[PDB]
Amino acid sequence: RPRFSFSIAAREGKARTGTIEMKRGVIRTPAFMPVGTAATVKALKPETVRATGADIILGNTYHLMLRPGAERIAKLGGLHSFMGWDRPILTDSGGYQVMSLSKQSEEGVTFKSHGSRHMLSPERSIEIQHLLGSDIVMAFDECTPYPATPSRAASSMERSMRWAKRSRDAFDSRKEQAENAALFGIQQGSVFENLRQQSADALAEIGFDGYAVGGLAVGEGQDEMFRVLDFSVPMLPDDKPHYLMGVGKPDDIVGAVERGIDMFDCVLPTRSGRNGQAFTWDGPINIRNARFSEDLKPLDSECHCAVCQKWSRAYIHHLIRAGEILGAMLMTEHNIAFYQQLMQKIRDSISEGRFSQFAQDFRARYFA
Amino acid sequence: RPRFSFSIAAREGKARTGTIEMKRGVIRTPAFMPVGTAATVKALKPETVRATGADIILGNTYHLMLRPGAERIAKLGGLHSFMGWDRPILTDSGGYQVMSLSKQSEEGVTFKSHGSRHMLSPERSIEIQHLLGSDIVMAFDECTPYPATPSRAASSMERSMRWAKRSRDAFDSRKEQAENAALFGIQQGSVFENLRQQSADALAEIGFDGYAVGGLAVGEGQDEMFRVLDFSVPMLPDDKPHYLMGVGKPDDIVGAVERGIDMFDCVLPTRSGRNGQAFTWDGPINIRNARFSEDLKPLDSECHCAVCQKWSRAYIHHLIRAGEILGAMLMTEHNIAFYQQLMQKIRDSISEGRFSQFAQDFRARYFA
Ligand SMILES: CNc1nc2cc(C(=O)NN)ccc2[nH]1
Ligand SMILES: CNc1nc2cc(C(=O)NN)ccc2[nH]1
Ligand SMILES: [Zn+2]
Ligand SMILES: [Zn+2]
């Protein structure tokens, strides 16, 4: 089993499909990572996450360093053993959650807990991810809020590229990490094509196993996100995976794949599932709506998940309206399974040379 | 498959062990019924409930008639189909929850929802339980609060015995119910031996498939409950099952079996599981306690449940402290499995003629 081996098996336009082989398993691309921020994918056992088709999940440096603590997780055997997920885990490096939930300098950032005071830096972020035992480690960078000025973007991007170098060196200075895990760099530059190019060149100069597109899914709109992707993804090394952080709605994922993205993560299927939103091929539905009170059909008429094989909309309606935990469990399992079936349909259509048609057919029905 | 067939396979003192055969399955006695008040055993899929060893679960007439409604559940195919549990279901008849959560007469009771106004009577309670499709139907009675006067007890008991007759006739007047389901009567009389005898005679005069001991688990203390059981259970027909409603803690169950009880129900393993209390053979523990933050052992060192095979105390500690749904799921599955292993140990020890020794050994270690 290799440390990190990305193969592209088929292409169509800018879209690609293939695999990433790692020590703890194979990751089919394009891939969706369920989010497991507090060492759990909310309301699901790891076996259920795997059953839906997930190959890899996402954990969070910022959250786990606060609770229950990275030194503690290391002492208890690592994140995989701690939560019972034995497949690959990607860990965000803490930059986006420091800005979103929690005194910056060139050395790093000090911040207050969501409330004690804590510190993060490129070297400290990489060491926490070693302690957690992450398989895909993210370089630590400095995010700037949206809609950032053109100067707030260039300053955050330039620093992030210097921090990308220190992340590389810290990772490479840890033998167990460099031999068993992989390191991704994060392209910044906001919506500015020249800054995105400068970021891409700096990251390719350093050299990473994969490249993320940062600074999107921040309230910019899909048209702007698609516009930024149009020129930004072709700047990244073609032969490495492309990871769009924080995205997104089903139609966002399809358009992003059409533009060359290989990996995705978003809290939407879990979070909105608990809120009562179920994804279907005819678009989302709110299972709390009174129209579902006596609807015996499954959540989606085609879905293969265990929820749609056993329980009705009317039952899940009742559960969510009564605030029952089982309602959150069933809604979440269905939504994560819907996302995985979507990625499977994308992978199959690219490999068969009919992804353009699939995308057109998908949007025609989903937005009907 | 018979409608209702209770066999006693072995005895020891007053304790008995055996089976109840019903159309939807076999119920091993002494039995513990997990409580599924809102058409769900809280935080568990029915398959997980069955995995822990449960043969039968309990539903609630008062709750289901309010939400989502009994006529509705009937229209959607019945309670079994609605929630996905295809084995026996016992339904409490609504008397205790009317008094506890929600204008009485000889005809019945009118009350306000937990908030519209609603009505219950012996005939209306039996019809709701038919609509739900319950396998074991409970007679509708009139509970009086604890610590009831000697006059509040005799008046509630006498009315309950008249209501037990109307429940019998309403059940018997419904052909599908009388042929496929069973009917239990509820002994009342508070702590008064003469009233308990009058209740027992009236119920045996009518004739039921089983007999419950009502009016306990109301804040009377275990010594008083055991005292009431000492004379009350021998008043019931020996050849029918004896059901102690609302009980209870592990040591309550053992002492109750020693006194002739065959069936049990309590929210304690589910409710206190969500609150962080885990049952072990060395007594309960609060998994939130800081002493468990780095404890890699399972919840209980002997437990056979899937939770104790996979996850540590330290992980479940973290989950419950973060308010994670998975914490409630794992705590609940372990507690219900612990209860079922307790009943299995009771059944095995009675059948082997060593239940007295088991009870002594159990209490010595549980209260150490
Ligand atoms: C949900 N939106 C969203 N945007 C993100 C951006 C980043 C980023 O630029 N990290 N360096 C990370 C996670 C994100 N999640
Ligand atoms: C938890 N305690 C508890 N006591 C109960 C008494 C009755 C009763 O007398 N019904 N007729 C029913 C359920 C109970 N649950
Ligand atoms: Zn589904
Ligand atoms: Zn266990």
GROMACS .gro file of N, CA, C and O in nm, chain A residues 38-48 64 67-68 72 75-77 81-85 274 293-296 306-307 310-312 314-315 317-319 321-326 328-330 333, chain B residues 38-48 64 67-68 72 75-77 81-85 274 293-296 306-307 310-312 314-315 317-319 321-326 328-330 333:
model
  384
   38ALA      N    1  -1.597   1.724   1.541
   38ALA     CA    2  -1.571   1.692   1.681
   38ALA      C    3  -1.541   1.543   1.702
   38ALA      O    4  -1.584   1.482   1.800
   39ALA      N    5  -1.465   1.482   1.611
   39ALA     CA    6  -1.432   1.340   1.617
   39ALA      C    7  -1.557   1.253   1.608
   39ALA      O    8  -1.562   1.144   1.664
   40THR      N    9  -1.658   1.303   1.536
   40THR     CA   10  -1.776   1.225   1.501
   40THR      C   11  -1.842   1.291   1.380
   40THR      O   12  -1.851   1.414   1.374
   41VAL      N   13  -1.888   1.210   1.285
   41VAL     CA   14  -1.980   1.259   1.183
   41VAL      C   15  -2.116   1.259   1.250
   41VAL      O   16  -2.165   1.152   1.288
   42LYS      N   17  -2.176   1.377   1.265
   42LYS     CA   18  -2.285   1.398   1.360
   42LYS      C   19  -2.402   1.303   1.334
   42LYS      O   20  -2.456   1.299   1.224
   43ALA      N   21  -2.437   1.224   1.437
   43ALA     CA   22  -2.551   1.131   1.440
   43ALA      C   23  -2.529   1.001   1.363
   43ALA      O   24  -2.625   0.925   1.342
   44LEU      N   25  -2.404   0.969   1.326
   44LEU     CA   26  -2.374   0.846   1.255
   44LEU      C   27  -2.258   0.772   1.320
   44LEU      O   28  -2.154   0.832   1.353
   45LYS      N   29  -2.274   0.642   1.333
   45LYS     CA   30  -2.160   0.556   1.362
   45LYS      C   31  -2.068   0.550   1.240
   45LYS      O   32  -2.114   0.555   1.126
   46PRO      N   33  -1.937   0.538   1.262
   46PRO     CA   34  -1.845   0.518   1.149
   46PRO      C   35  -1.886   0.407   1.053
   46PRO      O   36  -1.869   0.423   0.931
   47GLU      N   37  -1.942   0.297   1.104
   47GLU     CA   38  -1.983   0.190   1.013
   47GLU      C   39  -2.093   0.239   0.919
   47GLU      O   40  -2.096   0.203   0.800
   48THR      N   41  -2.181   0.325   0.970
   48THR     CA   42  -2.286   0.382   0.886
   48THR      C   43  -2.229   0.481   0.786
   48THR      O   44  -2.272   0.484   0.670
   64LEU      N   45  -1.049   1.997   1.750
   64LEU     CA   46  -0.991   1.889   1.829
   64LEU      C   47  -0.878   1.937   1.921
   64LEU      O   48  -0.855   1.876   2.025
   67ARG      N   49  -1.092   2.053   2.224
   67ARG     CA   50  -1.167   1.949   2.291
   67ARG      C   51  -1.172   1.828   2.201
   67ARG      O   52  -1.226   1.834   2.090
   68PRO      N   53  -1.119   1.715   2.249
   68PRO     CA   54  -1.065   1.690   2.382
   68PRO      C   55  -0.916   1.718   2.397
   68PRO      O   56  -0.860   1.685   2.501
   72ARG      N   57  -0.398   1.466   2.419
   72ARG     CA   58  -0.483   1.361   2.475
   72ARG      C   59  -0.517   1.255   2.371
   72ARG      O   60  -0.504   1.135   2.396
   75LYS      N   61  -0.232   1.035   2.315
   75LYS     CA   62  -0.212   0.942   2.425
   75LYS      C   63  -0.310   0.825   2.420
   75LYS      O   64  -0.274   0.713   2.456
   76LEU      N   65  -0.433   0.849   2.374
   76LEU     CA   66  -0.534   0.745   2.364
   76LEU      C   67  -0.526   0.665   2.235
   76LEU      O   68  -0.617   0.587   2.206
   77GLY      N   69  -0.421   0.685   2.155
   77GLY     CA   70  -0.395   0.603   2.038
   77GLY      C   71  -0.416   0.667   1.902
   77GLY      O   72  -0.396   0.599   1.800
   81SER      N   73  -0.826   0.543   1.601
   81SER     CA   74  -0.864   0.453   1.709
   81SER      C   75  -0.968   0.516   1.800
   81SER      O   76  -1.066   0.452   1.839
   82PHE      N   77  -0.949   0.644   1.833
   82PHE     CA   78  -1.038   0.716   1.923
   82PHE      C   79  -1.183   0.711   1.875
   82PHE      O   80  -1.273   0.676   1.952
   83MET      N   81  -1.207   0.744   1.748
   83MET     CA   82  -1.345   0.751   1.699
   83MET      C   83  -1.392   0.624   1.629
   83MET      O   84  -1.511   0.614   1.597
   84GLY      N   85  -1.302   0.530   1.601
   84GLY     CA   86  -1.344   0.406   1.534
   84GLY      C   87  -1.359   0.413   1.384
   84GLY      O   88  -1.442   0.339   1.327
   85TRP      N   89  -1.282   0.499   1.317
   85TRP     CA   90  -1.280   0.509   1.172
   85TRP      C   91  -1.138   0.475   1.128
   85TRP      O   92  -1.044   0.549   1.160
  274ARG      N   93  -3.026   1.736   0.990
  274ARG     CA   94  -3.080   1.752   1.125
  274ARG      C   95  -3.187   1.861   1.131
  274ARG      O   96  -3.278   1.854   1.215
  293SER      N   97  -4.711   1.455   0.598
  293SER     CA   98  -4.759   1.392   0.721
  293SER      C   99  -4.815   1.252   0.696
  293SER      O  100  -4.815   1.169   0.787
  294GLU      N  101  -4.866   1.226   0.575
  294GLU     CA  102  -4.924   1.096   0.543
  294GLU      C  103  -4.864   1.039   0.416
  294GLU      O  104  -4.926   0.954   0.351
  295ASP      N  105  -4.743   1.082   0.380
  295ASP     CA  106  -4.677   1.040   0.257
  295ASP      C  107  -4.600   0.911   0.288
  295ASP      O  108  -4.503   0.913   0.365
  296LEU      N  109  -4.643   0.800   0.230
  296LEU     CA  110  -4.578   0.672   0.258
  296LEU      C  111  -4.454   0.646   0.172
  296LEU      O  112  -4.384   0.547   0.197
  306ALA      N  113  -3.036   0.268   0.319
  306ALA     CA  114  -3.115   0.184   0.408
  306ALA      C  115  -3.236   0.259   0.461
  306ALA      O  116  -3.337   0.196   0.498
  307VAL      N  117  -3.230   0.392   0.467
  307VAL     CA  118  -3.344   0.468   0.516
  307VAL      C  119  -3.458   0.463   0.417
  307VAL      O  120  -3.574   0.441   0.454
  310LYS      N  121  -3.658   0.130   0.416
  310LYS     CA  122  -3.736   0.086   0.531
  310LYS      C  123  -3.844   0.184   0.575
  310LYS      O  124  -3.956   0.141   0.606
  311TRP      N  125  -3.816   0.315   0.580
  311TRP     CA  126  -3.905   0.409   0.648
  311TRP      C  127  -3.969   0.509   0.552
  311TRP      O  128  -3.911   0.546   0.449
  312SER      N  129  -4.088   0.554   0.587
  312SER     CA  130  -4.162   0.650   0.506
  312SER      C  131  -4.126   0.795   0.539
  312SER      O  132  -4.079   0.827   0.648
  314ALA      N  133  -4.362   1.000   0.600
  314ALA     CA  134  -4.452   1.033   0.709
  314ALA      C  135  -4.390   1.002   0.845
  314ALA      O  136  -4.411   1.076   0.942
  315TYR      N  137  -4.317   0.891   0.856
  315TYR     CA  138  -4.252   0.859   0.983
  315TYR      C  139  -4.140   0.958   1.014
  315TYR      O  140  -4.128   1.004   1.127
  317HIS      N  141  -4.108   1.258   0.902
  317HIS     CA  142  -4.180   1.381   0.934
  317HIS      C  143  -4.213   1.389   1.082
  317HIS      O  144  -4.186   1.489   1.149
  318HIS      N  145  -4.276   1.283   1.133
  318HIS     CA  146  -4.316   1.278   1.273
  318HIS      C  147  -4.196   1.288   1.365
  318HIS      O  148  -4.199   1.360   1.466
  319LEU      N  149  -4.090   1.213   1.333
  319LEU     CA  150  -3.970   1.214   1.417
  319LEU      C  151  -3.910   1.353   1.426
  319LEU      O  152  -3.872   1.398   1.534
  321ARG      N  153  -4.050   1.639   1.370
  321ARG     CA  154  -4.139   1.732   1.436
  321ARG      C  155  -4.142   1.711   1.587
  321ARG      O  156  -4.163   1.808   1.662
  322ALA      N  157  -4.119   1.588   1.635
  322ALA     CA  158  -4.115   1.561   1.779
  322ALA      C  159  -3.977   1.585   1.840
  322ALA      O  160  -3.961   1.562   1.961
  323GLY      N  161  -3.879   1.628   1.762
  323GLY     CA  162  -3.742   1.644   1.809
  323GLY      C  163  -3.671   1.516   1.846
  323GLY      O  164  -3.580   1.519   1.930
  324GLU      N  165  -3.707   1.403   1.784
  324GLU     CA  166  -3.649   1.274   1.817
  324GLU      C  167  -3.512   1.255   1.752
  324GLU      O  168  -3.489   1.290   1.636
  325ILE      N  169  -3.419   1.199   1.831
  325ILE     CA  170  -3.284   1.171   1.783
  325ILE      C  171  -3.287   1.082   1.659
  325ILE      O  172  -3.209   1.101   1.566
  326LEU      N  173  -3.377   0.983   1.657
  326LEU     CA  174  -3.380   0.895   1.541
  326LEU      C  175  -3.410   0.974   1.413
  326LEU      O  176  -3.364   0.937   1.305
  328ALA      N  177  -3.293   1.274   1.336
  328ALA     CA  178  -3.164   1.325   1.292
  328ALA      C  179  -3.077   1.213   1.235
  328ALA      O  180  -3.010   1.232   1.133
  329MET      N  181  -3.080   1.096   1.298
  329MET     CA  182  -3.004   0.982   1.247
  329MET      C  183  -3.047   0.944   1.105
  329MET      O  184  -2.964   0.929   1.014
  330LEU      N  185  -3.178   0.930   1.083
  330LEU     CA  186  -3.225   0.883   0.953
  330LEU      C  187  -3.208   0.989   0.845
  330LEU      O  188  -3.167   0.958   0.733
  333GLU      N  189  -2.828   0.996   0.759
  333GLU     CA  190  -2.781   0.882   0.682
  333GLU      C  191  -2.830   0.893   0.538
  333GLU      O  192  -2.753   0.873   0.445
  406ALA      N  193  -4.283   0.770   2.186
  406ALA     CA  194  -4.320   0.848   2.067
  406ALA      C  195  -4.297   0.771   1.937
  406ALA      O  196  -4.252   0.828   1.837
  407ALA      N  197  -4.326   0.641   1.936
  407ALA     CA  198  -4.305   0.556   1.820
  407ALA      C  199  -4.158   0.548   1.783
  407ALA      O  200  -4.123   0.531   1.666
  408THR      N  201  -4.071   0.559   1.884
  408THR     CA  202  -3.928   0.533   1.869
  408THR      C  203  -3.871   0.503   2.007
  408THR      O  204  -3.907   0.569   2.104
  409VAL      N  205  -3.782   0.404   2.015
  409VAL     CA  206  -3.698   0.389   2.134
  409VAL      C  207  -3.586   0.489   2.115
  409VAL      O  208  -3.508   0.477   2.019
  410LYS      N  209  -3.577   0.587   2.205
  410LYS     CA  210  -3.503   0.711   2.180
  410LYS      C  211  -3.357   0.682   2.145
  410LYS      O  212  -3.286   0.617   2.222
  411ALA      N  213  -3.314   0.729   2.027
  411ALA     CA  214  -3.176   0.722   1.976
  411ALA      C  215  -3.134   0.585   1.923
  411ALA      O  216  -3.015   0.563   1.897
  412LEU      N  217  -3.230   0.494   1.901
  412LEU     CA  218  -3.199   0.361   1.848
  412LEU      C  219  -3.289   0.327   1.731
  412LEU      O  220  -3.412   0.347   1.736
  413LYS      N  221  -3.229   0.271   1.627
  413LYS     CA  222  -3.306   0.204   1.524
  413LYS      C  223  -3.366   0.075   1.580
  413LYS      O  224  -3.306   0.009   1.665
  414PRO      N  225  -3.485   0.036   1.534
  414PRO     CA  226  -3.542  -0.093   1.575
  414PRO      C  227  -3.446  -0.211   1.560
  414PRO      O  228  -3.445  -0.300   1.647
  415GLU      N  229  -3.363  -0.212   1.455
  415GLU     CA  230  -3.270  -0.324   1.440
  415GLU      C  231  -3.170  -0.327   1.556
  415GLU      O  232  -3.133  -0.435   1.605
  416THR      N  233  -3.132  -0.209   1.605
  416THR     CA  234  -3.042  -0.202   1.719
  416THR      C  235  -3.112  -0.244   1.848
  416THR      O  236  -3.054  -0.313   1.931
  432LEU      N  237  -4.921   0.875   2.159
  432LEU     CA  238  -4.948   0.853   2.017
  432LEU      C  239  -5.085   0.906   1.975
  432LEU      O  240  -5.103   0.942   1.858
  435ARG      N  241  -4.988   1.277   1.907
  435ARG     CA  242  -4.892   1.298   1.800
  435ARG      C  243  -4.827   1.165   1.767
  435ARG      O  244  -4.760   1.106   1.852
  436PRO      N  245  -4.843   1.119   1.643
  436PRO     CA  246  -4.906   1.186   1.529
  436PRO      C  247  -5.055   1.157   1.515
  436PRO      O  248  -5.112   1.197   1.413
  440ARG      N  249  -5.438   0.845   1.218
  440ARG     CA  250  -5.332   0.860   1.119
  440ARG      C  251  -5.243   0.737   1.112
  440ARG      O  252  -5.215   0.684   1.004
  443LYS      N  253  -5.411   0.468   0.931
  443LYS     CA  254  -5.415   0.492   0.788
  443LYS      C  255  -5.282   0.461   0.721
  443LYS      O  256  -5.279   0.414   0.607
  444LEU      N  257  -5.170   0.485   0.791
  444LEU     CA  258  -5.037   0.458   0.737
  444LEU      C  259  -4.992   0.314   0.758
  444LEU      O  260  -4.875   0.283   0.734
  445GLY      N  261  -5.081   0.226   0.805
  445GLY     CA  262  -5.053   0.084   0.813
  445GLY      C  263  -5.034   0.025   0.951
  445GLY      O  264  -5.009  -0.096   0.961
  449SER      N  265  -4.560  -0.117   1.124
  449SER     CA  266  -4.512  -0.072   0.994
  449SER      C  267  -4.456   0.070   1.002
  449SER      O  268  -4.350   0.100   0.947
  450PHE      N  269  -4.527   0.158   1.074
  450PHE     CA  270  -4.488   0.298   1.087
  450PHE      C  271  -4.346   0.312   1.139
  450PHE      O  272  -4.265   0.384   1.079
  451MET      N  273  -4.313   0.244   1.249
  451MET     CA  274  -4.181   0.262   1.310
  451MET      C  275  -4.079   0.157   1.267
  451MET      O  276  -3.961   0.172   1.302
  452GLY      N  277  -4.121   0.052   1.198
  452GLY     CA  278  -4.026  -0.051   1.156
  452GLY      C  279  -3.987  -0.154   1.260
  452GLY      O  280  -3.875  -0.207   1.255
  453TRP      N  281  -4.077  -0.185   1.353
  453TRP     CA  282  -4.057  -0.290   1.453
  453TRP      C  283  -4.166  -0.394   1.430
  453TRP      O  284  -4.284  -0.364   1.447
  642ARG      N  285  -2.886   0.892   2.801
  642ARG     CA  286  -2.867   1.022   2.737
  642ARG      C  287  -2.811   1.125   2.834
  642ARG      O  288  -2.741   1.219   2.792
  661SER      N  289  -1.176   1.067   3.142
  661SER     CA  290  -1.130   1.142   3.025
  661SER      C  291  -1.024   1.067   2.946
  661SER      O  292  -1.009   1.090   2.825
  662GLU      N  293  -0.946   0.982   3.012
  662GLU     CA  294  -0.839   0.908   2.946
  662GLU      C  295  -0.849   0.758   2.973
  662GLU      O  296  -0.750   0.686   2.961
  663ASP      N  297  -0.969   0.711   3.007
  663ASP     CA  298  -0.992   0.571   3.041
  663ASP      C  299  -1.020   0.495   2.911
  663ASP      O  300  -1.123   0.518   2.846
  664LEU      N  301  -0.929   0.406   2.872
  664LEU     CA  302  -0.947   0.333   2.747
  664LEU      C  303  -1.035   0.209   2.760
  664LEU      O  304  -1.066   0.147   2.657
  674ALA      N  305  -2.214  -0.413   2.129
  674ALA     CA  306  -2.127  -0.362   2.024
  674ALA      C  307  -2.053  -0.237   2.067
  674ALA      O  308  -1.945  -0.207   2.015
  675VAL      N  309  -2.109  -0.162   2.163
  675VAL     CA  310  -2.043  -0.041   2.209
  675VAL      C  311  -1.919  -0.076   2.288
  675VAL      O  312  -1.812  -0.017   2.269
  678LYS      N  313  -1.613  -0.186   2.075
  678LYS     CA  314  -1.547  -0.095   1.983
  678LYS      C  315  -1.492   0.032   2.048
  678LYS      O  316  -1.379   0.073   2.016
  679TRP      N  317  -1.567   0.098   2.138
  679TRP     CA  318  -1.532   0.233   2.180
  679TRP      C  319  -1.494   0.239   2.328
  679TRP      O  320  -1.542   0.161   2.411
  680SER      N  321  -1.408   0.334   2.361
  680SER     CA  322  -1.362   0.353   2.498
  680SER      C  323  -1.454   0.444   2.579
  680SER      O  324  -1.528   0.526   2.526
  682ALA      N  325  -1.326   0.689   2.737
  682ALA     CA  326  -1.275   0.823   2.708
  682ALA      C  327  -1.344   0.885   2.587
  682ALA      O  328  -1.371   1.006   2.585
  683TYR      N  329  -1.373   0.805   2.484
  683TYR     CA  330  -1.443   0.860   2.367
  683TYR      C  331  -1.587   0.895   2.402
  683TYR      O  332  -1.636   1.001   2.362
  685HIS      N  333  -1.707   0.964   2.693
  685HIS     CA  334  -1.693   1.082   2.777
  685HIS      C  335  -1.692   1.210   2.695
  685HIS      O  336  -1.765   1.305   2.723
  686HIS      N  337  -1.605   1.213   2.594
  686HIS     CA  338  -1.591   1.330   2.508
  686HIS      C  339  -1.721   1.360   2.436
  686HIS      O  340  -1.762   1.477   2.426
  687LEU      N  341  -1.784   1.256   2.381
  687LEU     CA  342  -1.909   1.275   2.307
  687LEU      C  343  -2.016   1.336   2.395
  687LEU      O  344  -2.087   1.428   2.353
  689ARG      N  345  -1.985   1.502   2.670
  689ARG     CA  346  -1.949   1.636   2.713
  689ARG      C  347  -1.966   1.739   2.602
  689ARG      O  348  -1.997   1.856   2.631
  690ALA      N  349  -1.950   1.699   2.476
  690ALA     CA  350  -1.970   1.790   2.363
  690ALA      C  351  -2.115   1.799   2.317
  690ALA      O  352  -2.143   1.870   2.220
  691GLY      N  353  -2.206   1.727   2.382
  691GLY     CA  354  -2.346   1.721   2.339
  691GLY      C  355  -2.370   1.652   2.206
  691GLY      O  356  -2.469   1.683   2.139
  692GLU      N  357  -2.284   1.557   2.168
  692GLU     CA  358  -2.296   1.489   2.040
  692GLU      C  359  -2.402   1.379   2.042
  692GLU      O  360  -2.414   1.303   2.138
  693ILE      N  361  -2.480   1.373   1.934
  693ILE     CA  362  -2.584   1.272   1.919
  693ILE      C  363  -2.526   1.132   1.931
  693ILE      O  364  -2.588   1.043   1.991
  694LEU      N  365  -2.407   1.109   1.875
  694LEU     CA  366  -2.351   0.975   1.884
  694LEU      C  367  -2.330   0.934   2.029
  694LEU      O  368  -2.339   0.815   2.062
  696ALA      N  369  -2.534   0.997   2.282
  696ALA     CA  370  -2.662   0.944   2.326
  696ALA      C  371  -2.690   0.808   2.262
  696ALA      O  372  -2.739   0.717   2.329
  697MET      N  373  -2.655   0.792   2.135
  697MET     CA  374  -2.674   0.663   2.068
  697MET      C  375  -2.595   0.551   2.138
  697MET      O  376  -2.648   0.444   2.169
  698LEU      N  377  -2.466   0.576   2.165
  698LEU     CA  378  -2.383   0.470   2.221
  698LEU      C  379  -2.418   0.441   2.366
  698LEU      O  380  -2.423   0.325   2.406
  701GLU      N  381  -2.752   0.239   2.358
  701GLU     CA  382  -2.738   0.102   2.313
  701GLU      C  383  -2.672   0.018   2.421
  701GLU      O  384  -2.718  -0.091   2.452
   0.00000   0.00000   0.00000
